[PDB]
Amino acid sequence: IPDGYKNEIDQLVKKEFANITLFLEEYRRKYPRIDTSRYIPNESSEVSLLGIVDSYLKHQEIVLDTLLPQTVSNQWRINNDYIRQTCTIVEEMNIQQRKQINDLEIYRKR
């Protein structure tokens, strides 16, 4: 009985039981360390010149040189093909485990 004998035996087993890094782990408490929230805002009228040039121009020039297209979609789709080779390998192992698992149960059945 998948509802009586298991419940019965469980009670009998129950009755016999009645008889018988520092920085990382601390951050886990649930707060990430704040980063530099400075570069994005700034102010023309406000304080500090370096922020204008020591924050925005050079990074924007590096951005415009970095922000690209020369290769475009070819570099992306080349990596997409690699992901498909990686995926099929896992499912082949899913099969190999599936066959040997059923094979062991098959021997028990006899």
């Binding site: 890094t21 920085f23 990382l24 782990e25 951050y27 886990r28 360390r33 980063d35 530099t36 570069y39 040039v53 020591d54 924050s55 925005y56 121009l57 050079k58 990074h59 924007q60 020039e61 590096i62 951005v63 970095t66």
Partner: protein
């Protein structure tokens, strides 16, 4: 396609003749000088045996953030495994004692049935 040390995409990959594995030259050259042996297989190996704005500010900042918070979190992962690799072995040995205690119980119960007939 990758290096078998850092997890890079090498610029000057070099392969070792003892164990067929491709490493970036600077990283393998460092290992030989530290201790003259292949890092993977632990086999004798020598050097001769082998065959501005965002870039300064934003991009470089992110690279040292990504390295810092990753290794710290990785150090946290290693601690948890050592923390309870112990909970695995203790629960395992706890089960061994149950089997050993039941092994005496069962055969003895089964032997009492054989004696009951007499």
């Amino acid at each position: 396609m990758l290096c078998a040390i850092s997890g890079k995409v090498p610029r000057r990959p070099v392969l070792s003749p003892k164990s067929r594995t491709i490493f970036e030259k600077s990283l393998l050259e460092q290992y030989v000088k530290d201790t003259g042996n292949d890092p993977i297989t632990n086999e004798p190996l020598s050097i001769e045996e082998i065959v501005s704005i965002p870039n300064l500010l934003t991009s470089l900042q992110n690279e040292w953030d990504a390295i810092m918070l990753e290794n710290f979190k990785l150090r946290s992962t290693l601690d948890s495994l050592t923390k309870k690799l112990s909970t695995v072995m203790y629960e395992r040995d706890a089960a061994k004692l149950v089997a050993a205690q039941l092994l005496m119980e069962k055969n003895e119960d089964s032997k009492d049935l054989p004696k009951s007939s007499q």
